[PDB]
Amino acid sequence: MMVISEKVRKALNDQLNREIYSSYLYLSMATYFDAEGFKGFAHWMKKQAQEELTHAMKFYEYIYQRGGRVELEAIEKPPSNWNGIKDAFEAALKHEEFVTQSIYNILELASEEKDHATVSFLKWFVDEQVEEEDQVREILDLLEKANGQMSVIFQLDRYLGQRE
Amino acid sequence: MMVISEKVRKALNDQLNREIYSSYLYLSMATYFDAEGFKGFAHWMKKQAQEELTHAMKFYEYIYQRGGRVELEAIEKPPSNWNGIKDAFEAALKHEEFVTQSIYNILELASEEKDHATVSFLKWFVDEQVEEEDQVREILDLLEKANGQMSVIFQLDRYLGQRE
Amino acid sequence: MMVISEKVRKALNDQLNREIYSSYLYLSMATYFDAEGFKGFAHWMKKQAQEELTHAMKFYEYIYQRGGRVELEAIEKPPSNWNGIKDAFEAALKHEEFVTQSIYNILELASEEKDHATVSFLKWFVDEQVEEEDQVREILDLLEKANGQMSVIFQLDRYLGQRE
Amino acid sequence: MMVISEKVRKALNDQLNREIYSSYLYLSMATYFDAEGFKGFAHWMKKQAQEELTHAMKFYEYIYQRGGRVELEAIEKPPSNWNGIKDAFEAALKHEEFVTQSIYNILELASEEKDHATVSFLKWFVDEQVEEEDQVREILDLLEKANGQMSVIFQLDRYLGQRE
Amino acid sequence: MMVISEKVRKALNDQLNREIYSSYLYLSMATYFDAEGFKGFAHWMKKQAQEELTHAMKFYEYIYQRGGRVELEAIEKPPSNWNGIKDAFEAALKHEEFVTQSIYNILELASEEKDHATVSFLKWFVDEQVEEEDQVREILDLLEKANGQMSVIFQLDRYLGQRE
Amino acid sequence: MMVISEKVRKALNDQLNREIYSSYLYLSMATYFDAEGFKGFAHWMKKQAQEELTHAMKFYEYIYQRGGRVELEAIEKPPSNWNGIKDAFEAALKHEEFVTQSIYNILELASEEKDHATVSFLKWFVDEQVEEEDQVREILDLLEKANGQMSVIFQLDRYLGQRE
Ligand SMILES: CCCCCCCCCCCCCCCCCCCC
Ligand SMILES: CCCCCCCCCCCCCCCCCCCC
Ligand SMILES: CCCCCCCCCCCCCCCCCCCC
Ligand SMILES: [Fe+3]
Ligand SMILES: [Fe+3]
Ligand SMILES: [Fe+3]
Ligand SMILES: [Fe+3]
Ligand SMILES: [Fe+3]
Predict the structure, then answer these.
(1) Where along this sequence does the record place binding of Zn(2+) 1 (chains A, B, C, D, E, F) (predicted)?
(2) Which of B17, B18, B23, B10 is nearest to B118 (CA)?
(3) Is D57 in the pocket of ligand 2 (CB under 6 A)?
């Protein structure tokens, strides 16, 4: 039997599908960077996409751990074009901040229901979101200091292309 | 400059999006097996989902190798339920055979345009499809011999749950 | 269900039986060389016979991979005598060319039916036939320069007797 | 000079050709098991076929050791269908017993001619036949206890599929 | 005896000589880069010249494999000078695209003659050409971003100078 | 600025192009030996050709070390038919002696202009030419003793085919 409420279950399932979209969005940023010839930035985005899938799968497994079931929904078509390298990363930061607020909404919902198990499960994503936002802000700071100079952009493209 | 025709480029991009859906479909079959309590079958489908992503990324990189560009499209909601283990794998076989026919269509299109580079690139997928169909047919044959016997279904579950 | 046409399955099954005969013929060339006291040439022919069996089993497994079935037919009696070492290799070359044309006929039949999976599977044998024909032409060219000189035939026998 | 009588050479050469047919018969049993979807039983039959070839080559080398020569004959078409797993292994047992009696017949002919070298050479095959018959009787005994229960057949298929 | 048509042997021998010129052209681009003081770009061109020689030798060995012989022709004087770093690489890309179409022409000729051995042999060069064209396009894209800035050109020189 | 005289740079550039032709000539002797079926002699010529390229590149790098520039010239069509094995190696000796005399002419020109750096650089080639002439003279002496005997020519072919 399911030991999460149907509201909490739906919120977790909604977030799972939101995490799938996050993965798709970053792949679409890879398609942009590859079109612009920045294979290192594209590689970073491909790695980021795979990292979002592991986020989706940890929502996946917690739902089944609490006796729930996952239902996959349609994934909306992501943007595919940005006005420059910085515009794509600014869009990524705005998306991660939106993801953080979506995690907060589940946390507050689970808290109102005294679903302590789900509140505590979500804390990993709270801490992880602090990292994901910080890593994009750091990239944005390096792009702002580069100020469009291709010598510095090349060094950061190769650097982000070294992602593990 | 793009050295594939727009027609061939669109055929390859369409197939990339079909591989994305294929991955999503197998993940949704995993959600079905996990809801039914068959963690080994669900594990098999998760491994299958990741294999489809490598198919999409192969199309991805070939498109850019020939000067094209990838555009990600919306992904349709896959089914989430099947009338049994055999029904799910029969749906899997029918989908893989459909995937093979779609690859065949790109091959014949590239062939009539004398796009030998794309014809030759597609050979890996032709050979790979032979094995994808054969492994589902083997599973279906084993499920047919099991004939609903739970002791034998349990053997098949943990066996497929060992997937590499 | 079988996903090769009955025409294509019959062509592959016919070739499987042809590969069995090719194996048998080379064993019968071994019986001739051993009767003549040339154990190195005989050893080469025994290794050649085993190589043909691996070709036959490759056809075997591809047929079942495509949902077909193998039927073994009677194997005709091969010749057991040749007019010297060079005559035997002339027969080997003539046989290998016949095998190559038989592979070609399956390839053209599969291509007419747009059976791309079988066309691509047969590529390995086209390439292998290039090597097998070349191996015998090289031996024949050496025998033509040898002109029957026993010192040269002995070293060639010892060398071919070293085949792994 | 040949130091076996022609009668004994013909007996040994006839048996060599019988071993070739035995190999072909077991390969044909593999085509049956593979058509029935029992890849472990099929694997067992493919290994049995290669072992029969080593028997043929043992007769081969002894014939030449005694100054005789081997003549390969036509290989009859083996049956390709059986009425079940038990029926195939029963046919295998009946064939191995027939092979044993054929070896016994050479032994008695050689001993009548006081060909002690051939009498002694055949001792290895007498002993080998004891094991070949016993290995099939053991398989038949397990199939009789299994009585068609797929739970037991699956494990026996995988077990025989491990034959080295 | 030659088992390729004389038309195909001439097409292959012509392409071998074209590969020889290709190495010479790249060596001549090296002389240009070395005169301009870019040892990394020159090093890249010297590696490219040796790669073209391995292409010529592949054609060489296949011609003899099929019973033909190679005839070397005069090598035309390549251009010595270019209007800049980008101008040289644009000429290289235009040449590689010309080499690809010449290979395409041999494939279509062999295919029309049903010379499946040569058709299948040429697939390696089709695939290699995709890599050769792409490698130069990437360099041209990086040179376009450099926009003449010596700070960025020094990065590309050192980077291309690390080619193995 | 260029610190070799224009006369010395041209003499060196001419010799560079001469070394390219020597490489091409030896490749063409390889085409002859391969057409005649002597893969060992052909192997020797292929190694010699690659050795001539390192000679050319040594001239290449010294020219730029002295501030000069390399200009590649047209390469003449080499001969492709010799009367026999010994005639080809006799032509190889004759060519190397011509190369040695061409090096002598540069050395005497450099010494007259008091270009001690070029005089000292050319000593490596003086000593190297002594070795290259000597190794062809040794092969010719063995071919003269063979006196056309194919058993002995085969031994020399195998021996020269072991060249590293
Ligand atoms: C080498 C680069 C890899 C990039 C991967 C990009 C993935 C994008 C995925 C979009 C969503 C489609 C459905 C994915 C299901 C994945 C299931 C994984 C189970 C472990
Ligand atoms: C030196 C051995 C030469 C043998 C020639 C035999 C020609 C007739 C063969 C008939 C039976 C063939 C059985 C082959 C079994 C191969 C199993 C391989 C499994 C991967
Ligand atoms: C590192 C510089 C390379 C420059 C190559 C220039 C080539 C010009 C053509 C001259 C003849 C080349 C002969 C090459 C023979 C190679 C044989 C290889 C055998 C495996
Ligand atoms: Fe996330
Ligand atoms: Fe796929
Ligand atoms: Fe074969
Ligand atoms: Fe090339
Ligand atoms: Fe030289």
Answers:
(1) 19, 52
(2) B10
(3) yes
- Inter-chain contact E116–C130, Cβ cutoff 8 Å? no
Task: Say if residues C32 and C81 touch (Cβ distance below 8 Å).
Answer: yes
Helix or strand holding residue C82 (H, E):
none
User: Which tokens belong to C4?
Assistant: 């090769």
Domain that holds residue C140: 1-164
User: What are residue B133's phi and psi, to 5 degrees?
Assistant: -65, -40
- How many distinct helices (H) and strands (E) make up chain F? 5, 0
CA of B129 to the centre of ligand 4 (A): 32
> In this structure, is the dihedral angle defined by the CA atoms of residues F151, F154, F156 and F158, taken in order, positive or negative?
negative
Burial class from Cβ neighbours inside 10 Å (0-12, 13-18, 19+) for residue E85 reads buried
CB E15 within 8 A of CB E110: no
DSSP H/E element including D156: helix D150-160
- Angle, to 10 degrees, between the axis of helix D85-112 and the axis of helix D39-65? 10
**Alpha-carbon distances of F70 from E22, E32, E34, F60, F125, rounded to whole Å:** 17, 8, 9, 7, 19
* Structure token pair of residue E98: 């010309």
**Closest Cα partner for B48 from B123, B118, B139?**
B139
CB C161 within 8 A of CB C43: yes
Name which of B98, B87, B99 is nearest B33 in CA terms: B87
Q: How many residues does chain E have?
A: 164
CA distance D100 to D95: 9
* Technique used: X-ray
Residue (of B36, B28, B25) closest to B85 by Cα position: B36
Q: How many domains does chain B have?
A: 1
Classify each residue of C135-149 as buried b or exposed e, where b means 16 or more C-beta atoms within 10 Å of its C-beta. bbbebbebbebbeee
Instruction: Spell out the residues 6+ positions from residue C89 whose beta carbon is closer than 8 angstroms to its own.
Output: C136, C139, C140, C143
SS3 state at C32: helix
**CB < 8 Å to C130, chain E:** 62, 65-66, 117, 121
Distance (Å, whole) CA A146 – CA A136: 15
Residue C35: name the closest of C70, C82, C74 by CA. Answer: C82
Element (H, E) at A75: none
Cross-strand partners of D152: none
Indicate the top mutation candidate among D27, D52, D73 to test ligand 2's pocket, ranked by most ligand atoms within 8 A of CB: D27
* Contact: D71, C80; criterion CB under 8 Å: yes
